[PDB]
């Protein structure tokens, strides 16, 4: 399990692998590790799968209620804070979550880290997961604010590739999403074994 996302000049690039494990046994290789919140927001999967999925689905319901009542879409700073207030109450009961909220609001790009430990921080770059430490090294050596879009695609896929290469627990398919001002669009979906031939 390795997920990363980073802000830059033309929006947010979100990349994720697709391996879910059961101990040493690999259960699946087609896990959709970026959960689609709404036409403008994305959430991420690290740690516990259902713990991520239920709270982000209920957050999508919450922000749709807010769109119906307040007649406007939700900001990142409000929605991620509601996710933090949902997951803060159940500290210490055994929950496991690592998430990134990615959208486009009036502050521009949005990228906030919220977990089941309760942490809530901003930042320009992030990476969460078991093989996340390998993703930081490949990500930060090419990262700057002035990245071009396709070079950002190459940096995201290369960092997830090296993270999947070193981590035994990470793998699957490198899924790549791009949130822009007019909405999020799917970039590509690529197997690791094809990119080993490419790289």
Please report, as ranges, the residues that interact with another protein according to CB under 8 A: 25, 28, 30-32, 48-51, 53-54, 57-58, 61, 64-65, 68-69, 84-85, 88, 91, 93-94, 113, 117-123, 126, 133, 136
> Least distance to another protein from the beta carbon of 18, Å?
10
Known binding-site positions for bortezomib:
49
Q: Give kind and range of the element (H or E) at residue 43.
A: strand 41-44
> Strand, helix or coil at 177?
strand
> Least distance to another protein from the beta carbon of 180, Å?
22
> Least distance to another protein from the beta carbon of 69, Å?
8
**Candidate list 1, 2, 99, 164, residue with the active-site label:** 1
Residue 3 is among the residues annotated as catalytic for this protein: no
Is the Cβ of residue 61 or residue 196 nearer to another protein in the bound state? 61
| Cβ-contact 83, 62 below 8 angstroms | no
Is the Cβ of residue 71 or residue 106 nearer to another protein in the bound state? 71
Task: For residue 94, give both structure tokens.
Answer: 């055994």
Is the Cβ of residue 84 or residue 156 nearer to another protein in the bound state? 84
CA distance 5 to 85: 22
Q: Which residues are catalytic?
A: 1
């Amino acid at each position: 399990t390795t997920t990363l996302a980073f802000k830059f000049r033309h929006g947010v690039i979100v990349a994720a692998d697709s391996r879910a494990t059961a101990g040493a046994y690999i259960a699946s290789q087609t896990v959709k590790k970026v959960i689609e919140i709404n036409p403008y927001l994305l959430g991420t999967m690290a740690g516990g799968a259902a713990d991520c999925s239920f709270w982000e689905r209920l957050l999508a319901r919450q922000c749709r209620i807010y769109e119906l009542r307040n007649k406007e879409r939700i900001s990142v700073a409000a929605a991620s804070k509601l996710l933090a207030n949902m997951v803060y109450q159940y500290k210490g009961m055994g929950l496991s979550m690592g998430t990134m909220i990615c959208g486009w609001d009036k502050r521009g790009p949005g990228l906030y880290y919220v977990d089941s430990e309760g942490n809530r921080i901003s930042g320009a770059t992030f990476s969460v997961g078991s093989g996340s430490v390998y993703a930081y090294g490949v990500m930060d050596r090419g990262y700057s604010y002035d990245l071009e879009v396709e070079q950002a695609y190459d940096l995201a896929r290369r960092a997830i590739y090296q993270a999947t290469y070193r981590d035994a627990y990470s793998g699957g398919a490198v899924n790549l999403y791009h949130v822009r001002e007019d909405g999020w669009i799917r970039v590509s979906s690529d197997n690791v074994a094809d990119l080993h031939e490419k790289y």
